[PDB]
Amino acid sequence: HHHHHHMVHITLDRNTANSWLIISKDRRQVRMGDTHQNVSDNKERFSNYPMVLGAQRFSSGKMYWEVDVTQKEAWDLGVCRDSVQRKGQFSLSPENGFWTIWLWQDSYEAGTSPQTTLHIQVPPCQIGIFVDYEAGVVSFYNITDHGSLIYTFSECVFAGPLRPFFNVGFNYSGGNAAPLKLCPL
Numbered sequence: 001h002h003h004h005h006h007m008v009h010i011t012l013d014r015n016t017a018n019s020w021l022i023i024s025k026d027r028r029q030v031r032m033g034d035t036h037q038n039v040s041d042n043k044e045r046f047s048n049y050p051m052v053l054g055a056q057r058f059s060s061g062k063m064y065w066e067v068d069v070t071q072k073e074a075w076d077l078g079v080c081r082d083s084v085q086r087k088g089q090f091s092l093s094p095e096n097g098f099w100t101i102w103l104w105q106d107s108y109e110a111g112t113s114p115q116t117t118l119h120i121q122v123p124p125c126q127i128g129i130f131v132d133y134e135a136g137v138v139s140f141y142n143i144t145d146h147g148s149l150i151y152t153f154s155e156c157v158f159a160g161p162l163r164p165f166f167n168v169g170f171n172y173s174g175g176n177a178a179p180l181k182l183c184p185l
């Protein structure tokens with residue numbers, strides 16, 4: 001792909017984070033804390049899952065960013081509507097305003113309804129995410145495997161501003177403490 005030149009500088013929005021997340025001072029890294037992080041509750045925070053949004057809102061154009069997932073067992077990545085539900089249980093699906101992929105129990109899947117099996121020969125250490133707002137496209141690239149395509153959502157009905165979306169995942173196993181990091185341009 002040749003999407004690298006639409007690179008955007010993404011930062012994380014503390015105020016949207018689940019109350020167990022620790023966002024670095026530069027707002028470029030997030031990890032699961034071992035306890036509630038001593039913050040007040042607010043209506044923006046994801047209550048049920050270890051999720052956080054980027055600060056940037058996109059309503060036009062072409063945007064690209066990269067996320068480091070080294071040594072994690074579980075995570076979700078992509079984009080979502082600014083108006084997604086924050087409280088209670090919900091599924092990651094385009095019907096609920098999410099365009100995502102994930103790793104879960106040694107398999108990669110796209111957040112369609114129902115979910116779609118991905119075919120990845122080289123486990124990725126970094127993921128590239130491309131959004132073309134006007135075309136209605138969200139694509140995912142395997143940076144570890146020379147930028148190979150992982151998945152394309154097409155005919156997307158965004159129906160609002162989009163925000164970068166992140167889930168660091170739970171750490172029941174002790175093998176999923178590693179952070180998500182936004183990679184430099």
Ligand SMILES: CN(C)c1noc(C2CCNCC2)n1
Pocket residue numbers: 018020047048049050170171172
């Ligand atoms: C409702 N949420 C977000 C929540 N409550 O407890 C927990 C812990 C569950 C085991 N691992 C650390 C997090 N998460």
